[PDB]
Amino acid sequence: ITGDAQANVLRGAGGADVLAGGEGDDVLLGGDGDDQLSGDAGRDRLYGEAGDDWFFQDAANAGNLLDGGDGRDTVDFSGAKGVFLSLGKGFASLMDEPETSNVLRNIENAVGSARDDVLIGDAGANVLNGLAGNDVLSGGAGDDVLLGDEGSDLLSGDAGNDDLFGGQGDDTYLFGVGYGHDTIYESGGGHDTIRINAGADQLWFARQGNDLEIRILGTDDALTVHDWYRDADHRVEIIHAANQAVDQAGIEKLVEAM
Ligand SMILES: [Ca+2]
Ligand SMILES: [Ca+2]
Ligand SMILES: [Ca+2]
Ligand SMILES: [Ca+2]
Ligand SMILES: [Ca+2]
Ligand SMILES: [Ca+2]
Ligand SMILES: [Ca+2]
Ligand SMILES: [Ca+2]
Ligand SMILES: [Ca+2]
Ligand SMILES: [Ca+2]
Ligand SMILES: [Ca+2]
Ligand SMILES: [Ca+2]
Ligand SMILES: [Ca+2]
Ligand SMILES: [Ca+2]
Ligand SMILES: [Ca+2]
């Protein structure tokens, strides 16, 4: 269902619909099912309604409302500067241009751009995908999946039990007291980093299968590095404990000491 240069009202039904507003200020109502909505140019109002809907939005096109409705909905800015978005506060704006903004409501997941983005989740379960560029990803509460992809990314799952995929490039992972049970999955990078804001002597390092497990004594908090021992591509090269740094040789010492 494709609009034209007029201000259109386009309404899908119960199936998986593809709605595109074209030019002008459109209203798109996806109905039930897993819809794909694009406002295109103009200032558009975009309602995914029930189902797991997808929104294709240019971060530089300001003045739209993207409303996922019920279900697990994704906003995608990947179709130049990056995007700053917050699912908790409910906005997305052009990096380097806060006045160029869009309203986000009822959206659970976000895909960024090939440029440097900042993607912030909310207290629910979120998937945040930075794609290329040097991105900052913050999960907030709830159980999140963060994908840094290519580039030098900063990942923090925050509270809840999070999966952190830094991707290729030199990635930094944040962890601390109250961060729950997080797992890191590394694919590549000669200088990945973990920064743990625990007191260093709260930390307990252990090998569990082929994983490295880092616990904070006194808490239920644990950071697992998946397949650490299986291959060098899955390792992080520096671990910081508060203001103290440890290398792989140093980590293995701590493990062996137990
Ligand atoms: Ca139109
Ligand atoms: Ca539909
Ligand atoms: Ca829908
Ligand atoms: Ca638009
Ligand atoms: Ca439009
Ligand atoms: Ca929806
Ligand atoms: Ca939703
Ligand atoms: Ca990016
Ligand atoms: Ca990235
Ligand atoms: Ca979250
Ligand atoms: Ca989280
Ligand atoms: Ca990366
Ligand atoms: Ca990496
Ligand atoms: Ca966490
Ligand atoms: Ca590495």
Q: Which technique was the structure solved with, according to the deposited record?
A: X-ray
Contact (CB, 8 A) for 98 and 114: no
Centre of ligand 11 to C-alpha 139, Å, is 4
User: 129-160 burial string, b = 16+ CB within 10 Å, else e?
Assistant: bbbbbbbbbbbbbbbbbbbbbbbbbbbbbbeb
Q: Do 202 and 153 belong together in one domain? A: no
Q: Do the domain assignments include residue 174? A: no
- Give Rg (Cα) of the chain: 21
Centre of ligand 13 to C-alpha 189, Å, is 4
For residue 6, the one-letter residue type is: Q
Centre of ligand 13 to C-alpha 11, Å, is 43
Q: Do the domain assignments include residue 86? A: yes
Q: Do 80 and 119 belong together in one domain? A: yes
Domain range for 199 is 179-188+195-258
Q: Do 45 and 93 belong together in one domain? A: yes
Quote the longest CA-to-CA distance of the chain: 71
Centre of ligand 7 to C-alpha 219, Å, is 33
Q: Do 6 and 71 belong together in one domain? A: yes
Residue position matching structure tokens 């973990």: 194
Contact (CB, 8 A) for 60 and 100: yes
State the Cα–Cα distance between residues 175 and 194, nearest whole angstrom: 7
- Report the run of H or E that residue 174 belongs to, with start and end: strand 172-175
Q: The dihedral of CA 235, 188, 150, 163: what is its sign?
A: negative
DSSP state at residue 230: T
Given the DSSP bridges, would you call strands 145-147 and 127-129 parallel, antiparallel or unpaired? Answer: parallel
DSSP secondary structure letters along 61-127: S-S-EEE--SS--EEE------EEEETTTTEEEETTEEEEEEEEES--EEE--SS--EEE--SS--E
Q: Measuring CA to CA, which residue among 158, 193, 154, 201 is closest to residue 177?
A: 158
Q: Do 67 and 119 belong together in one domain? A: yes
Resolution (Å units) = 1.8
Q: Do 212 and 89 belong together in one domain? A: no
Ligand closest to 235 (CA) is: 15
Q: Do 159 and 209 belong together in one domain? A: no
State the Cα–Cα distance between residues 142 and 158, nearest whole angstrom: 8
Q: Do 15 and 114 belong together in one domain? A: yes
